[PDB]
Design an enzyme around this catalytic site. Structure first.
Site, PDB file in Angstrom:
ATOM      1  N   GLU A 103      -1.453 -10.801  15.406  1.00 47.94           N
ATOM      2  CA  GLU A 103      -1.023  -9.638  16.160  1.00 47.94           C
ATOM      3  C   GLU A 103       0.059  -8.854  15.430  1.00 47.94           C
ATOM      4  O   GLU A 103       0.823  -9.415  14.653  1.00 47.94           O
ATOM      5  CB  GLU A 103      -0.595 -10.001  17.575  1.00 47.94           C
ATOM      6  CG  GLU A 103      -0.374 -11.448  17.817  1.00 47.94           C
ATOM      7  CD  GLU A 103       0.273 -11.671  19.168  1.00 47.94           C
ATOM      8  OE1 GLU A 103      -0.361 -11.327  20.201  1.00 47.94           O
ATOM      9  OE2 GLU A 103       1.415 -12.193  19.187  1.00 47.94           O
ATOM     10  N   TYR A 115      -3.775  -4.784   6.582  1.00 47.33           N
ATOM     11  CA  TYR A 115      -4.800  -5.519   7.306  1.00 47.33           C
ATOM     12  C   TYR A 115      -6.112  -4.768   7.314  1.00 47.33           C
ATOM     13  O   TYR A 115      -7.154  -5.337   7.002  1.00 47.33           O
ATOM     14  CB  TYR A 115      -4.355  -5.874   8.736  1.00 47.33           C
ATOM     15  CG  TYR A 115      -3.030  -6.606   8.777  1.00 47.33           C
ATOM     16  CD1 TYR A 115      -2.654  -7.498   7.759  1.00 47.33           C
ATOM     17  CD2 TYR A 115      -2.158  -6.420   9.844  1.00 47.33           C
ATOM     18  CE1 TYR A 115      -1.433  -8.164   7.817  1.00 47.33           C
ATOM     19  CE2 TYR A 115      -0.960  -7.087   9.920  1.00 47.33           C
ATOM     20  CZ  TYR A 115      -0.584  -7.939   8.913  1.00 47.33           C
ATOM     21  OH  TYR A 115       0.648  -8.556   9.015  1.00 47.33           O
TER      22      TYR A 115
HETATM   23  C1  LIG Z   1       1.165 -11.136  11.584  1.00 44.46           C
HETATM   24  C2  LIG Z   1       2.469 -10.484  11.077  1.00 44.46           C
HETATM   25  O1  LIG Z   1       3.254 -11.099  10.359  1.00 44.46           O
HETATM   26  S1  LIG Z   1       2.880  -8.830  11.513  1.00 44.46           S
HETATM   27  C3  LIG Z   1       4.434  -8.659  10.537  1.00 44.46           C
HETATM   28  C4  LIG Z   1       4.117  -8.073   9.141  1.00 44.46           C
HETATM   29  N1  LIG Z   1       5.308  -8.156   8.294  1.00 44.46           N
HETATM   30  C5  LIG Z   1       6.299  -7.279   8.396  1.00 44.46           C
HETATM   31  O2  LIG Z   1       6.301  -6.323   9.180  1.00 44.46           O
HETATM   32  C6  LIG Z   1       7.477  -7.538   7.452  1.00 44.46           C
HETATM   33  C7  LIG Z   1       7.943  -6.215   6.850  1.00 44.46           C
HETATM   34  N2  LIG Z   1       6.934  -5.737   5.894  1.00 44.46           N
HETATM   35  C8  LIG Z   1       6.534  -6.450   4.732  1.00 44.46           C
HETATM   36  O3  LIG Z   1       7.011  -7.519   4.477  1.00 44.46           O
HETATM   37  C9  LIG Z   1       5.551  -5.757   3.828  1.00 44.46           C
HETATM   38  O4  LIG Z   1       5.690  -4.406   4.067  1.00 44.46           O
HETATM   39  C10 LIG Z   1       4.068  -6.086   4.033  1.00 44.46           C
HETATM   40  C11 LIG Z   1       3.862  -7.559   4.225  1.00 44.46           C
HETATM   41  C12 LIG Z   1       3.591  -5.420   5.278  1.00 44.46           C
HETATM   42  C13 LIG Z   1       3.201  -5.519   2.916  1.00 44.46           C
HETATM   43  O5  LIG Z   1       3.468  -5.940   1.627  1.00 44.46           O
HETATM   44  P1  LIG Z   1       3.441  -5.139   0.480  1.00 44.46           P
HETATM   45  O6  LIG Z   1       3.568  -6.042  -0.534  1.00 44.46           O
HETATM   46  O7  LIG Z   1       4.422  -4.214   0.659  1.00 44.46           O
HETATM   47  O8  LIG Z   1       2.189  -4.517   0.503  1.00 44.46           O
HETATM   48  P2  LIG Z   1       1.291  -4.218  -0.654  1.00 44.46           P
HETATM   49  O9  LIG Z   1       1.992  -3.608  -1.693  1.00 44.46           O
HETATM   50  O10 LIG Z   1       0.411  -5.225  -0.963  1.00 44.46           O
HETATM   51  O11 LIG Z   1       0.508  -3.181  -0.217  1.00 44.46           O
HETATM   52  C14 LIG Z   1      -0.476  -3.409   0.622  1.00 44.46           C
HETATM   53  C15 LIG Z   1      -1.018  -2.143   1.235  1.00 44.46           C
HETATM   54  O12 LIG Z   1      -0.405  -1.836   2.437  1.00 44.46           O
HETATM   55  C16 LIG Z   1      -0.368  -0.488   2.609  1.00 44.46           C
HETATM   56  N3  LIG Z   1       1.000  -0.269   2.658  1.00 44.46           N
HETATM   57  C17 LIG Z   1       1.912  -1.132   2.279  1.00 44.46           C
HETATM   58  N4  LIG Z   1       3.111  -0.652   2.494  1.00 44.46           N
HETATM   59  C18 LIG Z   1       2.927   0.522   3.043  1.00 44.46           C
HETATM   60  C19 LIG Z   1       3.801   1.461   3.502  1.00 44.46           C
HETATM   61  N5  LIG Z   1       5.090   1.219   3.402  1.00 44.46           N
HETATM   62  N6  LIG Z   1       3.335   2.570   4.035  1.00 44.46           N
HETATM   63  C20 LIG Z   1       2.046   2.750   4.112  1.00 44.46           C
HETATM   64  N7  LIG Z   1       1.191   1.880   3.683  1.00 44.46           N
HETATM   65  C21 LIG Z   1       1.603   0.762   3.142  1.00 44.46           C
HETATM   66  C22 LIG Z   1      -1.211   0.107   1.575  1.00 44.46           C
HETATM   67  O13 LIG Z   1      -2.543   0.006   1.988  1.00 44.46           O
HETATM   68  C23 LIG Z   1      -1.047  -0.853   0.469  1.00 44.46           C
HETATM   69  O14 LIG Z   1      -2.288  -0.815  -0.146  1.00 44.46           O
HETATM   70  P3  LIG Z   1      -2.807   0.182  -1.184  1.00 44.46           P
HETATM   71  O15 LIG Z   1      -2.878  -0.722  -2.419  1.00 44.46           O
HETATM   72  O16 LIG Z   1      -4.205   0.343  -0.462  1.00 44.46           O
HETATM   73  O17 LIG Z   1      -2.041   1.381  -1.456  1.00 44.46           O
END
Ligand SMILES: CC(=O)SCCNC(=O)CCNC(=O)[C@H](O)C(C)(C)COP(=O)(O)OP(=O)(O)OC[C@H]1O[C@@H](n2cnc3c(N)ncnc32)[C@H](O)[C@@H]1OP(=O)(O)O
Length: 151
Positions: A103, A115
């Protein structure tokens, strides 16, 4: 180099640091240290001798739940969240797991995009399930079908 491995007792302090800097609404500490052990498949991603990311998952029968993924702010938008998830999905498949559930906050734009990009489908919405600063936010329940491979 980027090394994905099992997240073990010794790794937990550094993971808790990531939890606290990455999550806009962090778990409490007790919850964090409680999501380990029996039926947990917990992973970290190590970027050149530093933990960059972790993921907390539980396996029951042939399904699983990603309870948590987090990339430290220094390492975000670098593709590591995706790589960590991809490695988890692979591992789940070899374990016979057909569906990964999670979720997410409806406003966590970045998580939802990761996702969706991996093939998660919205399943169900829990309205105002998450607390915010001022009111509440919906929870999006998403499912990823993981199709079976040869071994
Ligand atoms: C079940 C749960 O845990 S829900 C909680 C999820 N975790 C959080 O909210 C913690 C805070 N956020 C994070 O730690 C990170 O932002 C994560 C885990 C969401 C993503 O990790 P990242 O390493 O940043 O993502 P990553 O670089 O792999 O990018 C993945 C994709 O996400 C999208 N994306 C990532 N960050 C962003 C952003 N800031 N804005 C828009 N899109 C984004 C893009 O699709 C990107 O893919 P792309 O290669 O298609 O351009």
């Amino acid at each position: 180099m980027n090394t994905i491995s099992i997240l073990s007792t010794t790794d937990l302090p550094a993971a808790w640091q990531i939890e606290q800097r990455a999550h806009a609404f962090p778990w409490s500490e007790k919850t964090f240290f409680g999501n380990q052990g029996e039926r947990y498949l917990n992973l970290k991603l190590t970027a050149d001798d530093r933990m960059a990311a972790f993921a907390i998952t539980q396996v029951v029968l042939d399904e699983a739940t990603l309870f948590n993924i987090a990339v430290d702010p220094d390492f975000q938008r670098r593709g590591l969240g995706r790589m960590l998830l991809e490695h988890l999905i692979d591992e789940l498949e070899t374990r016979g797991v057909v569906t990964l559930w999670l979720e997410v906050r409806a406003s966590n734009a970045a998580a939802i995009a990761l996702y969706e990009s991996l093939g998660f489908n919205e399943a169900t919405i829990r309205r105002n399930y998450y607390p915010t600063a001022q009111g509440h936010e919906d929870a999006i329940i998403m499912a990823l079908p993981i199709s079976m491979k040869l071994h």
